[PDB]
Design a protein around this ligand. Structure first.
Ligand code: ARG
Length: 212
């Protein structure tokens, strides 16, 4: 709080490849739900918003080393992450789905249908964590969902595992892709802050409570 207020700018870490929460528009702005949340936290602090964009798997370590104040980046509240960092009250529900090529005959519905397929994930996500739990799935890991889909679209992967909302976002803009599966997990995004910064966390929950 008072390091942020001193410096006049709240540093947000995210990965701008995840509509409709964080993505790059036609003008090269990071826009969408998570950015608006950030704007409304910064606005309430009287500081300005500095968006730091980086790969997803860079967020926790960035935050643990003070390069950022918060992670607002469609980040699922996991017990495993809850061990190193602290989370806000939940701000959105989502779950893993499987996106395939609408061409293909292949319509997986469960993770077991992906066994002996090549599956594209974003390193360090809950999709990555979860497909990695089934043997036989040949998991190929990408820094960016952009390149995970590119590769599906080429033919070099049989599917992409990611959150429901973003899947819908990516599918709306690639009519050669379809979501084959229903929702395969039950996740809730939170806003990640260091465990010491409890007066920041409480502020975020006050703002979060005030928006809803
Ligand atoms: N680039 C992103 N914003 N990815 C969101 C990650 C998806 C999921 N909520 C997770 O925490 O692993």
């Amino acid at each position: 709080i008072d390091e942020i207020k001193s410096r006049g700018y709240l540093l947000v870490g995210l990965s701008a490849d995840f509509p409709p929460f964080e993505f790059v528009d036609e003008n090269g702005n990071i826009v969408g739900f998570d950015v608006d949340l950030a704007k409304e936290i910064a606005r309430r602090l009287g500081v300005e918003l500095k968006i730091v964009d980086m790969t997803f798997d860079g967020l926790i370590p960035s935050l643990l080393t003070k390069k950022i104040d918060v992670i607002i980046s469609g980040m699922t509240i996991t017990e495993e992450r809850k061990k190193v960092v602290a989370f806000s009250d939940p701000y959105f529900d989502a779950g893993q789905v499987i996106v395939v090529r609408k061409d293909s005959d292949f319509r997986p519905k469960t993770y077991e249908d992906l066994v002996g397929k090549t599956v594209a994930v974003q390193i360090g996500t809950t999709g990555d964590i979860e497909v990695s739990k089934y043997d036989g799935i040949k998991v190929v890991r990408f820094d960016k969902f952009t390149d995970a889909f590119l590769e599906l679209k080429r033919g070099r992967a049989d599917a992409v595992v990611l959150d429901s909302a973003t899947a819908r976002a990516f599918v709306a803009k690639n009519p050669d892709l379809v979501i084959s599966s229903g929702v395969l997990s039950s996740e809730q995004y939170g806003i990640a802050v260091r465990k010491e910064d409890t007066d920041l966390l409480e502020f975020i929950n006050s703002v979060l409570r005030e928006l809803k």
